Amino acid sequence: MSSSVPSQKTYQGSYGFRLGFLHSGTAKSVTSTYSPALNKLFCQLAKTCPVQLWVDSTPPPGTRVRAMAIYKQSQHMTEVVRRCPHHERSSDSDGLAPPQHLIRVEGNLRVEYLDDRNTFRHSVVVPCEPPEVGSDSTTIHYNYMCYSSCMGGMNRRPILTIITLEDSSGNLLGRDSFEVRVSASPGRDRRTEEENL
Ligand SMILES: *CCC(=O)n1c2ccccc2c2cc(C=O)ccc21
Ligand SMILES: [Zn+2]
């Protein structure tokens, strides 16, 4: 699909940018859970996934935090990741996300969606906001709108989520990522995938 492949080099940058996650466990009723051993997130479709951000020092004002997805295996990394024909046309859009965009940010009125005219890649970016009073990290609530097994979509192809911090003018301050598997039963899948280890 695309003419380039985005760099995935994890890079902490001058502010020590990194991502954190909750310790949800693999109970049968969790809406998302992170496998530290897989560095892979297991979640349901369109259910809320909180991701935390951490920095050490003060970043410049007007900073924006952007998410993107790319297929994991070397032979698929140029295909743009998008919702499958069925899901794209499900008319459950929230009123902001492009109906073909896989990743939504939930509960933020300053979200921004981009279809990249040269890479053709979809991405969602929001403003960077400091941790609530008392807290020490920033939580962003993401959603994934297709199952990993969607034919015509990923079709069971693993994917990475690449989160990049950028300044107001759009330049890179740090990057981090993780793989993702979307299914209806994320606790059991996480359990089983760690077993196979
Ligand atoms: C863009 C969010 C932000 O400005 N921010 C965060 C986010 C998450 C964890 C910590 C943290 C900050 C810490 C400081 C000062 O040390 C300044 C801005 C921070
Ligand atoms: Zn689908």
Going from the Cα of 152 to the center of ligand 2, the distance in angstroms, rounded, reads: 7
Q: Whose CA is nearest to atom 18 of ligand 1?
A: 58
Nearest Cα to Cα of residue 35 among 196, 193, 147: 193
- What is the resolution of the experimental data for this entry, in Å? 2.4
Residue 59, ligand 1, Cβ within 6 A? yes
Residues forming a β-bridge with 177: 162
Method in brief: X-ray
Distance CA 197, CA 195 (A): 5
Going from the Cα of 123 to the center of ligand 1, the distance in angstroms, rounded, reads: 23
Provide the residue ranges of all domains of the chain, joining segments of one domain with +.
Answer: 1-197
User: 12-51: buried (b, 16+ CB within 10 Å) or exposed (e) per residue?
Assistant: ebebebbbebeebebeeebebbbbeebebbbbbbbbebeb
Residue 16, ligand 1, Cβ within 6 A? no
Distance CA 63, CA 159 (A): 26
Ligand 1 atom closest to Cα of 52?
8
Tokens of 100: 């073909």
User: 64-103: buried (b, 16+ CB within 10 Å) or exposed (e) per residue?
Assistant: bbbbbbbbbeeebbeebbbbbeebbeeeeeeeebbebbbb
Sign of CA dihedral 23, 28, 32, 35: positive
What does 41-106 look like in DSSP terms, one character per residue?
EEE-TT--EEEEEE-SSPPPTT-EEEEEEEESSGGGTTSPP---HHHHTS----SSS-TT-SEEE-
Q: Identify residue 78 by its one-letter amino acid code.
A: T
